[PDB]
């Protein structure tokens, strides 16, 4: 019964349905706050003063916003209450007529409140779970969410882990509530030693809703461990897609920049919300988007971005941070998609998400219905080392990355049954590296004029004759998309050095491998498209959806030397970045 | 996988590169002014750290206990600067920056490039009780990117950094700089680890 | 059949599974880089305070943002063990100590 | 019942408790070694010579050392024994507690 109800609740979450939620627990569930001035008088059947936003309140305001599933809640949380007290509460013996119960008890039980022992806690939490299932409610058990990031509630969390394993017998979904503030500042999220403030409870509720939308209720859920390219409407056991507004166009079009052709689109003049929820099994992850459109697309990645009443200044510091202070300053949420029509077909680096836990990536257009369109063709979430995580590209900080090298042999050395003829290296096309892309072209300007908005790449060319050529590809002039190639080190003589080396930014054109209906009626059903490696258009001359490339033109003073060339393009890139992303 | 750092074997790693743009290219609604590159702080790379300082000695005296890092500097004017940051002297924590390749003329080459090992200081983003009684409960601390102390002068818990000081023979050139610090590191190493 | 060392390895790995939380059905092997501290509870790394004297106190003197300074006091024998299933062929071990 | 007992055992391992462990199996569990000179005479109810350290012995010496959970073991391992023999062993029909 519990598994069936949890499956129904998961389908309601992912189908814009409605769920009635029972919030049962102690002071942490009730939203206890008696320390800060960000309080509201005791409500929801509790005696203690509550924070201005409790976790159930934020859950009920957040899950409908990010998934479209209407949430109505019943409060069965009293400060200082234990499992024995909760089971025998006179007003809680009736069925609240809900669909899912989110149960978090054990902090007060570990303190010996009401004579509670570990065995009593275990027995009465099991009894509560059975009673909740008998009431037709799916059971989501939480570990004891407390303050101090593991420094407090050790016995409470041991009992909570035992209770979670016991609840596995009943097929209960679980939420590791103790780790919702692990990557945050304690001062920013706590009212007292063990209770959260409004922002901490908001974070807890938002992570709970993130687990709901990610498919964490499902027993087949797996946290995101490697890079994934997901699109609107994609079904994975790691990333849960929610169409909150129900108007994301899952239509197939050749105008998409992905091979899945899903153009998942936010129509102009309507408020569309697309959210991707997952458990990030790493300390950090780079967020990339293949998106185009005219109207503003807004991305919210972490906690203070969704809700913040501004009651404390420090609520802004409550975003997920790196655990270690070393060379990791305070992280601010930076999730921007640059909608430059110049790079519309190109990948955009949204930003980074820090911390291990449940994450929601909210993609929404103008909520007032006065904005343009956005097409969320694909979303890339790439877990990275936290020291390699980039908050904002080319920002006021030193971004630690690796040296991405684009290697090619001219002529190719693969499957050459006979020795290939030596060729002259006068023209080749290498993918545009990350360091050369503009940062926020819509705001800071494109490379065409603001030729500082790019970085540099080193073109290392060597041939079988021992001749070496190190070329600094850097933009010194504006008015175009040409990178001046300055020769740094070469084994060539001055009369043998190439006179001018030109790197021209361009996009590959797209070509049809098989037009729809080429082989006959409806064979193939759809056009099978590919990037045309032979057709590339300079930026500004035309638009190409095949990817950012450099048209490298080497001009030789005399007849071009012929040899077997090794071409390497060295440039800075984000760790493990698959595509150069604006 | 590295068994022991700087041991009797060849440790296979990758080339960790610390990239920064001076001035930054992020969210520049207006074109930033060209700046002179005379001082910047880059995190200390792994290859430059001492191996077993308690046993083999620190870089202050045993200036062999460190390795080298290559500082590759390029600007929007096309000027390139490849600097070998290596420790040639003892008695301090200063790495001698030898210029390997530069597009600058001899009279335009920087006279002395100094990489000084240092630790960032720690600063309080929000002292405990700043907003009122118990708000915040605890001090929210961060590394002070503006305050760094040379090793031996003082102790800092903000991470190992290099205080790179570039001395120019004439007035420092102003341009849009691309700074890359190339050094050996363990594959995917997040922090330079002693 | 194993020798003394092989049986010792088998028993030590069995105890490693016990301490890692491998008995639990929610256990997951360690697949990516993790920054864990004393007293941290994860489904991948099992922390055991063998001697029961590791100080899980919070101090600004810690070099981590979690402020857990998990400490082995002087003049007392303290044992802190971290157990996990490594889902890779190798792993680099780093400490902020 | 098995899940509840395994949860209790996991909590004992991670809480410096005490567990009584039954080591049931064949020659590999008993620590069979009749090839090397690193042997000890047949003990723990087995007929075959054992290695100087068997897997259960190392488990009982290792888990308390690394987790603080005291371990006491009962040996029900005989070399050459199968599941049918183990189930119908006359001396193994009693509960080892």
Residue numbers in the entry:
A (entry chain A): 196 to 777
B (entry chain A): 584 to 777
C (entry chain A): 390 to 486
D (entry chain A): 196 to 292
Sentences from the paper on this structure:
We isolated and characterized two Shigella podophages that have notably different features when compared with classical podophages and instead are most closely related to phage N4. We describe the isolation and characterization of phages Moo19 and B2, including whole-genome sequencing and analysis, cryo–electron microscopy (cryo-EM) structure determination, mass spectrometry, host range studies, and enzymatic assays of the tail proteins. Our work shows that these phages have divergent decoration proteins and unique tail structures, and encode and package their own phage-dependent RNA polymerase, and the tails, which display esterase activity, are dependent on specific O-antigen modifications of lipopolysaccharide (LPS) for entry. Moo19 and B2 are similar to bacteriophage N4—these are all T = 9 podophages, which encapsidate their own polymerases—a hallmark of this phage family.
Because we could not resolve the highly flexible side tailspikes in either Moo19 or B2 virions, we purified these components to examine them separately. Genome analysis and mass spectrometry data indicated that the tailspike was a single protein in Moo19 (gp82) and a complex of two proteins in B2 (gp48/gp49). We used a similar approach as described by Subramanian et al. and purified gp82 alone. We also copurified a complex of gp48/gp49 as previously described. Using cryo-EM, we solved the structure of the isolated tailspikes to 2.4- and 2.3-Å resolution, respectively. The tailspikes most closely resemble that of the tailspike in phage G7C and differ wildly from the tailspikes in DEV, which more closely resemble a myophage fiber. Each structure is a homotrimer, with individual ribbons colored cyan, green, and magenta. Therefore, we tested the purified Moo19 tailspike gp82 and the complex tailspike from B2, gp49/49, for esterase activity using a colorimetric assay. Positive esterase activity would result in a visibly yellow color and increased absorbance with time. Both tailspikes exhibited a rapid, dose-dependent color change, indicating esterase activity. In G7C, this appendage is hypothesized to expand the host range; however, Moo19 and B2 have the same host range, so the function of gp81 in Moo19 is unclear at this time. Three major structural differences (see cartoon representation in Fig. 3B) include (i) the lack of the tail appendage, (ii) a single tailspike for Moo19 and a complex of two proteins for B2 (see next two paragraphs), and (iii) the completely different decoration proteins.
